[model samples]
Target: IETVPVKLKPGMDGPKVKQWPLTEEKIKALVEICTEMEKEGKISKIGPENPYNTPVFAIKKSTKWRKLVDFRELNKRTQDFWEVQLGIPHPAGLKKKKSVTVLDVGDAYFSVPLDEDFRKYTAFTIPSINNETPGIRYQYNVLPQGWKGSPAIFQSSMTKILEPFKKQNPDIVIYQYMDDLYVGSDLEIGQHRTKIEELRQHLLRWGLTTPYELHPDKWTVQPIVLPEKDSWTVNDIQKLVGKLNWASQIYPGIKVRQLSKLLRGTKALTEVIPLTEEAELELAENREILKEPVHGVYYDPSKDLIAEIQKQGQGQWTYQIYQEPFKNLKTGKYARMRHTNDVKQLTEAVQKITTESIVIWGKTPKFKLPIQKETWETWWTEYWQATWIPEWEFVNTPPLVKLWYQ
Candidate 1:
């Protein structure tokens, strides 16, 4: 319905100039995507008085050169932060809904029609064929990437397309975040089909004609995979934690120390440290579970049940009373107290775990991961004493996880 205007920043400075030297292949690839967008009425070769221009970048392993744009300059100039009404509902809203039918709005930004006058803000330059033309430039007639207003514009357009359904089908609940629309209802299967069909028709008329899948019949689920340790890149680690580590969310007790580093360093993994010894161990243990995890058995801690599990061939299950190992004048690092599962016979048989470990607590009480005892104790005390700011308390509480798995 509207194209959020891209207002320039103050100080009356001229447009930025960037020189991009391109190969023949690069130029061809860039021209193809750009020309296709123009042919589809997504952009225009309009002559403007003072067109805003920016450099474009490409994604590796992709044949398309019109892949991404540098919007930092334009974003800094944006004067308005438009409100986007389209967004996901609270968890409670989904609980009541019997089923969810998701509709994909392909090329979301391209589907929105840009305001004729405001289109100059999306202009960019390319290498000119001859001296007769100062430089070849193109502007977007429809919403395109690289502008701060693109998201809001696309969102507003989608809101207009879906808002009517709210009143028309009051019984059904719909949650939309940009192009991803979750049409939901507590009503039976036949009812949601009508809602989906109605939505499909509206979206088609709004120019979302690009091929996209509608997930009405099945719920989307991500599968977990084992991480490659030998040639592990930062991206590999990220995929492990973000998509493949399903058990991490399922079982809160397991902790991967380097996970925070990998997550925080998604944009620049080279700046941070790589996987540590403890992280490798965690991954190794997770690998076993992917095949067959040892089933957990419960018994009284007071009983010699610990000794029973640690006996002969079943020495895997064991616990320690003390936290960290201690060093002695003549001796080395050793656990204070440990329990074994079996009752030993008179015949001599000695057993020992060569490496000693200290489990650290690096998270909240319930889901803390192993940290160095030194760091863990300090963090634990500081956290307990720190005043819980009312603002921080506004977040969803336990039994609910934050947006970590992307």
Candidate 2:
């Protein structure tokens, strides 16, 4: 019944935060809207479970090193992912403990806007993007709609702000692209209260507020779901999914795969990277040598380390080899975005997987990877299905394949 289009703002974080902002204006409006609707006494009977119960899951990459993006197959697919609207109450930190005087910047609670688009992206596409970030070399986090760098960028940004936590480090595990902080540590209920309070204190410093339930004072209490009120359910998911299906032709196996991953739940990227059946086969057989952006987007053959297997020629173990890194790979070859320590980084900064200290290059050219040729095509196709295509749904309903390897 709630059908409204959200206006786009340049560089919004992700689908989850689509309704974004969670600004006081919007929040107040939302509160008034819900309260007013209820006051009108329009109860059309709800569902069994609290419809607002947000379902989130993680992405799993395959063992295969190379994934090919199949536009033809994608065109036949029928699903588009809409992102969730999330806005952190504070971009900085929140204090969760009484003993802790100040909380770290990262501890701030993000506020997710209850929009139709935001839920679909979370339910369907947010996972499985890292694979193609290399080929598309697009910064996953910033791109929003399921871009490669999204997860790590968001995770790290949240982590970076919370990097300096008192007592024990917060266990900010990522849920489907992202959701409530699932601090896995099993502390006493009271201890959990301290942890949340400490997080809130940190967020307050940044001039942000938490959801009333996810707020600082009620750290121990799980958030209450006023189902009839806040958080739209069925239509929200359908609206996004319907939009995605209209453009599903662009992404083949990726949609179903991304949805599958979301059902799976979050885990270590190391456990789920290189996600694809073909990719897993390739990785299983090939002798891998990591090929990352040593310099920029353009693959420098000079720096590319192709690991020659024991047997070469016709008797080789596999047709081709696979290579990549689960670390410090830049998304944009030469696309430079200004970053400050305190802009309270999002998913981009988190994409830095390798421990290597980030250093800006003097002349990294904006390189458009060659998607032509068999070798490029083979890898590009899978990357799209597994990564690029999977990610695109995180924002808008993409046209069948994403910007595939040219």
Candidate 3:
């Protein structure tokens, strides 16, 4: 593999970080892990004279400690962090009855060699366990974890490697997200297995390893158990909100309005606050929804698309996308698909739909509430003049007026 080099912004530099104090157990693990990494040619010893040095630490994961370098200070000095801009294939894109295989590459970032010239910027000192073991300094030979640009670099390289295979077998849909690959096949069991083997060969030629087959039935959503209502802290609510937000992406029934109360109560992460009865009820409802199976739907281009927007409170808008019933190939039955309770997604969905389909508004949609026309126009004008609105192509007429007139 070709070495990937990183460049810092002009005149940018970071102060060397002092080693953070660590527990005796962590010190021992860090020394052992660094020694193993050195043997694997992932890192090399560097003289203490190198000006750019960062702190190194370890965190316990499962049974082993995972070594990490603090690159926060270094990242600020690095050149523009390019966007990956690559889209992962949504689970909704999969055929209802297709067989899926998920593959994960081990030590993915470490597999890419870092340019020799840029290794000094990634240098770090290993703390000694005691007097018998003297401290040593080392720099990464391969791309280190926690670097802001590592994902973009790795993803670009992986995408380049898989281009030929994708072109050769367009029927096998492959989704690449960094080091994880999801391959979907609608072919028969025998043919599906053969295609996957061929893909493995393609990856093997590029020095990439593939493993794991996902079982649809084995995929299940586990409910998050919360602490006692009186013992809840801002940190606990924040963590719960983060997890649920991720879950809402896959499960549409999980709503954001239900989480608003808990979010409102949070001021500082460490501050303890008791949950209200209303908040508790909302959380319980979300937990119940998680227990149900996820309804995954494929997009049908032939179906009529519908958008339903609702206002929960001030500045809070939720929308759902629904498509008219379409025939399912596997079951030979007609079914409707709906994605619910999303806000920002509506903008993208609307923008895309407007290009190909005509949008028909109901006589009394949620946005068109009972209000005087003058008052409505004033409110609309205020929003229309906001910076968030895109530049209009029409010079004289406001876009809102054009739509209203139509």
Candidate 4:
């Protein structure tokens, strides 16, 4: 609905920009991504099933980005933080590290004003792009982005929802930073199945439903391998097996982390200071299941990820060098525009094996021609999240774990 300035005093036309910030291309792109994502899972599927042609407007209102210096003035400011952009990297490095679950904290405007229990302010709002109202209300007609505690409140108060998995099951690790919840294991297949069951139940009790709420399916199940005709390739261990050694540093976007883990797996592992009480459980759980890593990665500073996995499990899996473009083509450096075409290979794929089985299997080189085994030292490991925010400022921060294996 386009807003043509109207008058409250019959002669005064207040300036109201009825701009809907999402365009056809952007909508089409989103539809495409969602469609492809559906193919990636059973729950995240949708109609039209075509992203390139179909379009989807997934935007909502937010007042957190509005200007409200005080709490009382928290009324719908009649404006929008148009066309929001992110600072995440597209297609992280070849050495995939972490799975990032992007979280769009709605009601920024309402959240800031009402939830200012933490006195702070920033450039909250943005421009209207694609197609969005210059200003609008929420759910019914009230503060936008008004989810009570907003991202801060949600993360601090709610992340415990997924903590049990880490405690009960060592291999399954769940990390959340201001609502950007990431759950991963060190392996695929086995880890994927175990983790998804845990997560689904967690979500049920928590009463929080993601985009796939309508369809209760494998949003948490790890990947099993998606074939692309005449070829076999996939990036699903994180989703299906709940097994992943993802690096949150390389990529961009609020929820695009897991995509990278599909290919070239290397980069130094990062363990962020957790923001919940899940740490204690994770420690005890990992200790209990030392013999079986449902989903986990043994990080080394210099060696590729596959080597680290092999050493931890004793030559159970193998991976050679992969080709890339931007950076070194040797170990999945800068690859193609899509970036998913670099990783070597792991024998126990999503469909074939379990995410956590200490049982050993002889090494099967990831690639045809194998090279000498390279060694990397474990050093310089820290969470990028707490890097800038002071510990005192971070109400809840835990020690990150990048287990130095071999």
What pairs collide in candidate 3?
Answer: none
Q: Model 1, 37-122: lDDT tens per residue?
A: 77887777867676467755443322223345555555545533432232222333542456666555536677567777666666
List candidate 1 stretches off by more than 4 Å: 1-6, 9-26, 36-51, 57-73, 83-118, 126-135, 145-148, 151-160, 168-198, 205-406
Predicted candidate 3 versus true structure: per-residue lDDT over 171-196, tens digit per residue: 77665433345677777878888888
- Distance (Å) between predicted and true CA of 135, model 2? 37
The lowest-lDDT stretch of 10 consecutive residues in candidate 2 is 354-363
Which order, best to worst by TM-score? 3, 1, 4, 2
Q: Which is the better candidate, 3 or 4, if ranked by TM-score?
A: 3
Q: Estimate each model's TM-score.
A: 0.38, 0.20, 0.42, 0.26
Please give the ranking of all candidate structures by lDDT, highest first, separated by commas: 3, 1, 2, 4
Per-residue lDDT tens digits for candidate 4, residues 137-237, read 21111122321223333343354655665577664444332223444444554555556655656665666654201111221212112211222133222
CA-lDDT, candidates in order: 0.45, 0.27, 0.55, 0.26
Top candidate on lDDT is 3
Q: lDDT of candidate 2 vs native?
A: 0.27
Better lDDT candidate (1, 3): 3
Clashing pairs in 1: 306-340, 306-341, 307-340, 307-341, 307-342, 308-341, 308-342, 309-341, 360-370, 360-371
